Design a protein around this ligand. Structure first.
Ligand SMILES: [Mg+2]
Lengths: 124, 98, 104, 53, 71
């Protein structure tokens, strides 16, 4: 654990949120998981693809419950989910970037790891 | 698909809870009996254990139409990884046998 | 209270069955329970007859397998606890014993 | 994938097979053995059948 | 138990056409969404799944053998 940093916040919440079955990876699953009321925290990176699905993610996080966090560097959150489960995700064979995520369920509520977003929601 | 991830995990957790698996050699029966019975066809159980055995992890016997699968140490470790358990828990088999 | 109660014994080896029966008779008459002696129901014989040969070749020999089943009854007039007790004791070998509520 | 993976097998030789060798063709239904005619001579003793006729 | 004969129609599978992913939503003012195709009002489909449009048919992808409408 860390000191509430954004570059620790994603790493901290992710590692419990895979176990809590929360991550709609990819863009179509993010959309389909936002059209139902299961979503909680949404993530996007820099543009390496369509210059309008960025507009898609911000419009969708906007239209119901504003909760977005933006963090660039697609390959980083990619490698943080870099293989289908937690062992050798750093295996360079496959290291696809997510370029979007929706957390449904943000892990076991703990250790201020969710409070980092509470420190942003009405503050930013 | 070879089977749904839901079905895989349901089979693996049962094997870990007990420590040993059994199914008759039959691809047609619609549900496995036992604690998979609400959900899973035993074709999936056979097909799953075959992959598990080819990677160590399991010992296999077959006598009058019925597989008997034991979980070995490598299997304990891999399943303890794959299911994210308290890294020291095993309800499979724990008592000194007199 | 005092009830009729019938014990039925079944097996395939006769000596075990007969010795079990005589010992139950002993244990019953040491308490003076007015035992009605063993009734020997007819023995049953199961017959199975098959060709000897795995394939179809040879002169046509057959096997004649058979298994035998012996069955007898004893009747007691007494309370339940003594009989379910003494029944529960003194059976070492492979013999089937079934005791019921009442048969009279 | 397929909804045509079987058609009624509820009587006759398609229904039944030996509890040991899984073969058809010459099994004993008497007394509920359900056992191939060759496989039964093999265990005819452990069941208890003895030849003395 | 012998050599085969030559077939002249071999084609194992359909090649499973590959499409660019999602243009079914339209952002149509800054922060405003439009839906080009309704979500199948079938109780088990969660109303986050998009019903098809054919040239004169609406068909539900997840209602495997139901929800086809004639217009
Ligand atoms: Mg007679």
């Amino acid at each position: 654990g860390g000191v509430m940093d954004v570059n620790t916040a994603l790493q901290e919440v992710l590692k419990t949120a895979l176990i809590h079955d929360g991550l709609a990876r990819g863009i179509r699953e993010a959309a389909k998981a936002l059209d139902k009321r299961q979503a909680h925290l949404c993530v996007l990176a820099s543009n390496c693809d369509e210059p309008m699905y960025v507009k898609l993610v911000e419009a969708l996080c906007a239209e119901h419950q504003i909760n977005l966090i933006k963090v660039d560097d697609n390959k980083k959150l990619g490698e943080w989910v870099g293989l289908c489960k937690i062992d050798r995700e750093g295996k360079p064979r496959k290291v696809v970037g997510c370029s979007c995520v929706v957390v449904k369920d943000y892990g076991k509520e703990s250790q201020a790891k969710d409070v980092i977003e509470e420190y942003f929601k009405c503050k930013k | 698909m070879l089977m749904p991830k839901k079905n895989r995990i349901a089979i693996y957790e049962l094997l870990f809870k007990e420590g040993v698996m059994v199914a008759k050699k039959d691809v047609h029966m619609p549900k496995h009996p036992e604690l998979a019975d609400k959900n899973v066809p035993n074709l999936h159980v056979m097909k799953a254990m075959q992959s598990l055995k080819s990677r160590g992890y399991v010992k296999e016997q077959f006598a009058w139409r019925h597989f008997y699968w034991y979980l070995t140490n490598e299997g304990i470790q891999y399943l303890r990884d794959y299911l994210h358990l308290p890294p020291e828990i095993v309800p499979a088999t724990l008592r000194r046998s007199r | 209270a005092i009830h009729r109660i019938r014990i039925t014994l079944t097996s395939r080896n006769v000596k075990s069955l007969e010795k079990v029966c005589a010992d139950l008779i002993r244990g019953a008459k040491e308490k003076n329970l007015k035992v009605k002696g063993p009734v020997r129901m007819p023995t049953k014989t199961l017959r199975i007859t098959t060709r000897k040969t795995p394939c179809g070749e040879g002169s046509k020999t057959w096997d004649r397998f058979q298994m035998r089943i012996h069955k007898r009854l004893i009747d007691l007039h007494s309370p339940s606890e003594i009989v379910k007790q003494i029944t529960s004791i003194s059976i070492e070998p492979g013999v089937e014993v079934e005791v019921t509520i009442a048969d009279a | 994938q397929q909804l045509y993976w079987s058609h009624p097998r509820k009587f006759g030789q398609g229904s039944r097979s030996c509890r040991v060798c899984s073969n058809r063709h010459g099994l004993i239904r008497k007394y509920g053995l359900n056992m191939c005619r060759q496989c039964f001579r093999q265990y005819a003793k452990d069941i208890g059948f003895i030849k003395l006729d | 138990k012998k050599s085969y004969t030559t077939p002249k129609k071999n084609k194992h599978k359909r090649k499973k056409v590959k499409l660019a992913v999602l243009k079914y939503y339209k952002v149509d003012e800054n922060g405003k969404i439009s839906r080009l195709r309704r979500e199948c009002p079938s109780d088990e489909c969660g109303a986050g799944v998009f019903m098809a449009s054919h040239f004169d048919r609406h068909y539900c992808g997840k209602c495997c053998l139901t929800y086809c409408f004639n217009k």
